[PDB]
Amino acid sequence: QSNRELVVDFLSYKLSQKGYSWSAVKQALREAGDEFELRYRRAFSDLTSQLHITPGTAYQSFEQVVNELFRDGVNWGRIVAFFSFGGALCVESVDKEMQVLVSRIAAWMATYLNDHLEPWIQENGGWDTFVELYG
Amino acid sequence: QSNRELVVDFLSYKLSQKGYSWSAVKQALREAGDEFELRYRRAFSDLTSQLHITPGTAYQSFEQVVNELFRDGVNWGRIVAFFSFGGALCVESVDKEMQVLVSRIAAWMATYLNDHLEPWIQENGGWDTFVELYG
Amino acid sequence: QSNRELVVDFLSYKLSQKGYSWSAVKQALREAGDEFELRYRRAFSDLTSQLHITPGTAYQSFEQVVNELFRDGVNWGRIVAFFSFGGALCVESVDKEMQVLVSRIAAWMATYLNDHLEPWIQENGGWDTFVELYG
Amino acid sequence: QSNRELVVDFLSYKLSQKGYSWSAVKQALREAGDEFELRYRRAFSDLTSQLHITPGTAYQSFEQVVNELFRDGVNWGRIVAFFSFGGALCVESVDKEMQVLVSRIAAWMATYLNDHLEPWIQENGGWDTFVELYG
Amino acid sequence: QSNRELVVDFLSYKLSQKGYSWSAVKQALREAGDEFELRYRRAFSDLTSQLHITPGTAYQSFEQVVNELFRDGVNWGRIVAFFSFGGALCVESVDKEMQVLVSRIAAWMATYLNDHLEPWIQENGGWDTFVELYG
Amino acid sequence: QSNRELVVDFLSYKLSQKGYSWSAVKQALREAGDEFELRYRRAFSDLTSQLHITPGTAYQSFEQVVNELFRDGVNWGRIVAFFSFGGALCVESVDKEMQVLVSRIAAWMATYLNDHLEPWIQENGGWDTFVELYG
């Protein structure tokens, strides 16, 4: 349904809100999500220290947890809580996954520099010499 | 060495340059990288369609490729090409990995909505009803 | 049901058809799949550039996409399109996953040779010497 | 060096030899590898039941093992044993990884058929009806 | 439901039973599981050599297999067989995943020692010297 | 070298010490490790909140970090710190990886029970009925 467009709008809203860049009733949902987060996020991290996705997370785990959100009934408030929870999950996941990805590539580059390139750089006057030439 | 601080500066420069947000001689390197990219990136994607990292990429593959960059000697130009290559690798990797991550979480949420929540939403007047109440 | 035997037959048919080796109504399905592919695959890659599986693809993503294949109704033609889509997905996935796997092992071997073995090989007359002896 | 072309030739030789399809001194190496395998593979699986790669295998593990192959010296025979070992590793890895990949996609398809498609198929005369029409 | 508490109890029972440490009707289920395992596990490994999880196993594969356990009907015996199967799956998965994890970290440490530390250790009298000092 | 036997002994010592079960100078190293941990682990978690391995951690990251342990020289104390660090890394990694693995399998089982089995269980008197029969 348009449920996915709803989800996508909420997720990109929350992501851009926390300062992540990559380049209808949706409004009411954005605002209710904000309101919820402003009221309840201290009230949700003391037993909610889960935070993070692993690349091998199954949908069934997600389902079980959110199931305990809806165990004794669906109202609009817990739907909002659901969206907010998904958004927090998203923000955290991309945060840490981006840390590890960039860290991996940076580590690789540092390694290659230190093995194959630093000798030459030392026998040619170091980076100083560089900024002289291609400065 | 300070090689890693160099690498990190270049990577965050290139990432923020392509519009990715998450919240010395470094200058000469930034500029030489830019210059290189402005001169050679059409000249590098016709046999350079590799682009992407897999979560199971080994450093040895990276090493072999960059090795073919330095096969017959190290000069400053190919060092710059090395940094630029690493930056392109980074940008592409985070781009696509972020697409798949966010897509996964969004798919999960859409699924849960459509299985456990949409019935109730239909028996309570739909999202219209929602924007009436928590509007 | 026998749905899985159907699926498996179609997948191995399509894989062996594209030249991949590893060592009923099924016929009508093979032929309809072929026919479909002969009619529509230029008509499916301009907005269908997805191609590839990641080891961390969820069933929910697959479900959402194929859902947009069946959004306004099931007929036999879109069932055939479904099978063909699955087969294309399979072929592409194994193609690229095999590239990266073999590339990883090959890179490892090249590395080990170049670190631990090439010295000795150079102090014993090189591979020429080898083909003299164990030739 | 040309070490990688050596490795690649040996790997594709061994893979095509075991019947896997995807579409110099190399000869002496192919033959010595064959000879080795014909002499020693019963002599190598009783304490060599390792077989398989995981997507998260490090080069360091590979290095340690092959290190125990070369612990007290490099001769041509153990170089050949090295290539043969790498080839066996490759063949096994692609074998099992292909099993799990194809099995995953097939399982997905079976699932989707059984949830979204089989009802309709039952209300339209089943696959028999299909082979009548698009036969 | 309390189905998950059931599952969790059975899994931790079976894990602690095989000697894995990490720090109601449940009883009847534990005992029936034991009884089942004592009667049928030779009768289940000749065509049941699957054993292992990959980090990229989908729930759909699990579902298909267990589906063939329940193909022609649910009775209590096959429910017990289901729990026992899940427990075996668990034990095997953690066994092998723990082997590979610990092996990876150990390999890393061995590598670092042999590259950065062993020189110094040799120029300072070796580990003997160590047990003299911090003994 | 025997460096790996050293590493393995230390790792299994530390793991069994924290209560994990799976079924020379080594002593001086065990004791020095213990001593170190008793003196410094409050002094190491305020800027050392890293803890965890991802299945896609490269050796190069490990190398860079431990490199900052040895930046201005190798003495025996920092070798001990190295072993202790590796052991902590191991314990944490297996802890959390075991949590997620067992949680995944348990979630799968709960799901299957709730979809395919719970209906039948409700039409046959529930688990009470079970403990009557196979009690």
Author numbering:
A (entry chain A), B (entry chain A), C (entry chain A), D (entry chain A), E (entry chain A), F (entry chain A): 3 to 25, 85 to 196
Question: Which statements did the authors publish about this structure?
Answer:
The Bcl-2 family of proteins is a key apoptotic regulator in response to a wide variety of stimuli perturbing cellular homeostasis.
To delineate the poorly understood structural transition steps between water-soluble and membrane-bound conformations of Bcl-xL and ultimately the molecular mechanism of Bcl-xL, we determined the X-ray crystal structure of Bcl-xL in the presence of the detergent n-Octyl β-D-Maltoside (OM). In the dimeric conformation helices α6-α8 of one Bcl-xL molecule are reciprocally exchanged with α6′-α8′ of the other, retaining the hydrophobic binding pocket exposed to solvent. The helices α5 and α6 in the water-soluble structure fuse into a single long helix, which interacts with the equivalent helix from the neighboring unit oriented in an anti-parallel direction. But the dimer-dimer interface is weak indicating that the hexamer could be a transient oligomer or just an effect of crystal packing. Similarly a major conformational change is observed in the α5-α6 loop, which converts to an alpha helix in the dimeric form. The solution Rg and Dmax values match well with the dimeric crystal structure Rg value of 24.5 Å and the Dmax of 79.6 Å. The mutations E158P and M159P arrested the OM induced dimer formation of Bcl-xL, indicating that the α5-α6 loop region is critical for Bcl-xL dimer formation.
